[PDB]
Design a binder for this molecule. Structure first.
Ligand SMILES: NC(=O)c1ccc[n+]([C@@H]2O[C@H](COP(=O)([O-])OP(=O)(O)OC[C@H]3O[C@@H](n4cnc5c(N)ncnc54)[C@H](O)[C@@H]3O)[C@@H](O)[C@H]2O)c1
Ligand SMILES: NC(=O)c1ccc[n+]([C@@H]2O[C@H](COP(=O)([O-])OP(=O)(O)OC[C@H]3O[C@@H](n4cnc5c(N)ncnc54)[C@H](O)[C@@H]3O)[C@@H](O)[C@H]2O)c1
Ligand SMILES: O=C(O)CCc1ccc(O)cc1
Ligand SMILES: [Cl-]
Lengths: 286, 286
């Protein structure tokens, strides 16, 4: 009947932060939406789009905003040092949460830094776009949002963050931080990794007279979609989820090694079978 | 008048590509007969029902009553040889045979050995992961590359014919030796298929009694693996027929993947970024 999120801080006002801010307003949130960014232009473009009401590039200026709900949306490796400043600035009743692509250890360090204020999350929604000029107001509609509560999580804040994601249309599901990094190490980080390595392959396998990038129409096209992926976002994911990424890369090698042994032996029905399972499983999801 | 040059067309393999060929031929104003040959009698009746072929047969002998002067081989690649042996005597000396097979190389020379002057090797760089005459399109080749692989033995009159025919359906024709062809598409087509298939195979064997990874397709897995729904027989044929190149391509890819793994393990922040930045190469886009 009447609610309690006064002032919302968007930390890192780019594509995800702006999609959050826009989505939230479009769901009928009527309080303040503020921005903190190291880039004055991220805040400038954002204000000019009516995406935020006001922002800054001083973290100290954030206290004048009195945020009670903070969404972290910069690259994941900026989170810890930002949480530290925030822990001196934020009211004990503020809630802090995030859209970072990695969870695991990060969620525990952030609980430790921010005490009971922290709830880890990750919307599985993305279109590989960069910058706030690209942000959408319906990005989260029908998408899984994963929250990663731990024994220490404040239940009410868990509930508050969950409601909020539902208001922008997300479908919420809980996972342990560790399980999240495994699941997404395999389902998301590993595919990006092989996409980057494929692009690298075609660079090294071109000759001066033969440009392999002239011939995308035979299966490579979907892979070029990594053209748009942000190199700093991915460097940060790869390092922060290092262990699980190595594991996922190893399982893949395992799969690729099998397939190629089938090719070497010049199998036939084994190979056909292998391809047949893969088709069947990949069709199940679409 | 002009097309006394092509009167009776045989499509061998009345599937997605064979039917897309028949459909584009008709659409471009071909008035002659289009016949079909397939070991699957359902391919034939479906093609006739859909107005894609006028008549067809599952009996190779029958093909002689059709009197074909232009044959487009559209079955899985490893059927071409045995089929060719049947055609070498069923077909007129004045007939032309060409193909849409995804591999060239040795198979081109073999087919000019069986078929003589009749044969011209070809490969339209068009299509999708779908199988079956039901998914045939009438505009599949428009503005797509088509690679013809003439040799020192190719009849020049038949080359011009096939080339013209690909142009009448919207194709953009260029030439490659049969060996360069198999190198190029080994790397830009066959390798991305192997990699997509192995990507799916990875989620199968990294799933667990604690988690079905197929439940989370939205972080990159889906987009990158459409082509893993491709047809198992077609791909088996491709991997075996072009094995020396597929193996070289896969090894080259492992060299790239290993490089990235290396940058990740030693947390080489700057190099990683620069490796990922490779995707911003102009060569690539759209
Ligand atoms: N597909 C996706 O784009 C997607 C999906 C899920 C999660 N995420 C997560 O969203 C977060 C942000 O991603 P994005 O795609 O919006 O990126 P983006 O490149 O648009 O924006 C990042 C924004 O954060 C700002 N920023 C960078 N360093 C900062 C710092 N030290 N302090 C304050 N601000 C800083 C940048 O100026 C930019 O405005 C990441 O944690 C990422 O893992 C992205
Ligand atoms: N996008 C693509 O799917 C694509 C693109 C370019 C080239 N190709 C090539 O085109 C050919 C056909 O591919 P498709 O995707 O149309 O496969 P498809 O499965 O749709 O159709 C192949 C057809 O050949 C028939 N067939 C199988 N063995 C046969 C035999 N021994 N004799 C006669 N018919 C036989 C099948 O019954 C089927 O009707 C393949 O050589 C493939 O490499 C495919
Ligand atoms: O599905 C795709 O995008 C690849 C289509 C495609 C597959 C094989 C081939 O030889 C040419 C084209
Ligand atoms: Cl192409």
């Amino acid at each position: 009947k009447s609610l309690s999120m006064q002032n919302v801080l968007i930390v890192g006002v780019g594509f995800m932060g702006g999609s959050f801010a826009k989505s939230l307003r479009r769901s009928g949130f009527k309080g303040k939406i503020y921005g903190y960014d190291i880039n004055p232009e991220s805040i400038s473009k954002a204000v000019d789009l009516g995406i935020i009401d006001e922002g800054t590039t001083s973290i100290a200026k954030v206290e004048d905003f009195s945020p009670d709900f903070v969404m972290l949306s910069s690259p994941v490796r900026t989170f810890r040092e930002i949480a530290k400043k925030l822990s001196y600035i934020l009211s004990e009743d503020a809630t802090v949460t995030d859209q970072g692509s990695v969870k695991g250890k990060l969620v525990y360090d952030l609980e430790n830094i921010l005490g009971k204020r922290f709830v880890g999350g990750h919307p599985i929604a993305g279109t590989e776009k960069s910058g706030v000029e690209y942000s959408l107001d319906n990005l989260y509609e029908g998408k899984k949002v994963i929250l990663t509560p731990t024994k220490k999580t404040d239940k009410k804040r868990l509930k508050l963050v969950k409601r909020v994601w539902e208001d922008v249309g997300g479908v919420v599901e809980y996972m342990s931080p560790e399980l999240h990094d495994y699941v997404f190490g395999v389902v998301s980080h590993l595919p990006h990794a092989v996409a980057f390595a494929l692009v690298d392959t075609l660079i090294h396998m071109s000759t001066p007279e033969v440009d392999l990038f002239k011939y995308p129409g035979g299966g490579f096209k979907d892979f070029t979609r990594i053209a748009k992926s942000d190199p700093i976002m991915w460097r940060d994911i790869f390092l922060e989820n290092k262990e699980n990424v190595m594991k996922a890369i190893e399982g893949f090698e395992k799969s690729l090694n099998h397939l190629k042994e089938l090719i070497v032996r010049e199998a036939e029905e084994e190979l056909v079978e292998y391809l047949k399972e893969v088709k069947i499983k990949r069709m199940e999801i679409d």
